[PDB]
Design a protein around this ligand. Structure first.
Ligand code: HEM
Ligand SMILES: [Cl-]
Ligand SMILES: [Cl-]
Ligand SMILES: [Cl-]
Ligand SMILES: [Cl-]
Ligand SMILES: [Cl-]
Length: 152
């Protein structure tokens, strides 16, 4: 279920995210590369990337756009961490294009973990981060299951 963050937890999340926020596209490029390299079955889900070696696409416009738009969503979730409806709406809006896609919970959760590992958070910040990400996945998966309207 969705579980709100305290004011103090919101601050922890903003602080945890600050290094990424200040280098959003650069972080996105690295994290998205590391994700596709560690979990190679996922590159095929991206039609613009499909059929080419990862090291050939990593430097391309198409690749950087995809990595950017993932991180722009998380950046907007963080922006909205103190507004549950606003946070939910960010997710609701990005969920529609994923609904029909053959992407497993495993794949999404693997990306969550690459992001986590990259942040090297202490346990206080990591706890707050995981509250937010648990909310993120709650909403996202509700929307993938066609129960997106409950957040409206
Ligand atoms: C969980 C965090 C994620 C976020 C915040 C996110 C965000 C986005 C955004 C903003 C769009 C752009 C709208 C569009 O052109 O359709 C998009 C589309 C798409 N995403 Fe995601 N995504 C996430 C995870 C994933 C994963 C893990 C995969 C595949 C393994 C994936 C595959 C796709 C595909 C294939 C598209 C449709 C556009 C395209 O064909 O690239 N997404 N996503
Ligand atoms: Cl894989
Ligand atoms: Cl490859
Ligand atoms: Cl994506
Ligand atoms: Cl607010
Ligand atoms: Cl930390």
């Amino acid at each position: 279920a969705f579980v709100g963050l305290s004011d103090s937890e919101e601050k922890l999340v903003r602080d945890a995210w600050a290094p990424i926020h200040g280098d959003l596209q650069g972080t996105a490029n690295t994290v998205f590369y590391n994700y596709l390299k560690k979990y190679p079955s996922n590159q095929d889900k991206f039609e613009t990337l499909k059929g080419h070696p990862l090291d050939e696409v990593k430097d391309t416009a198409n690749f950087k756009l995809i990595a950017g738009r993932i991180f722009t969503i998380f950046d907007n979730c963080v922006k909205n961490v103190g507004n549950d409806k606003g946070f939910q709406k960010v997710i609701a809006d990005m969920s529609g294009p994923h609904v029909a896609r053959p992407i497993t919970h495993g794949s999404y959760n693997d990306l969550r973990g690459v992001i986590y590992d990259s942040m090297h958070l202490d346990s206080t910040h990591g706890a707050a981060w995981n509250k937010m990400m648990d909310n993120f996945f709650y909403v996202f998966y509700e929307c993938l299951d066609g129960r997106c309207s409950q957040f409206s």
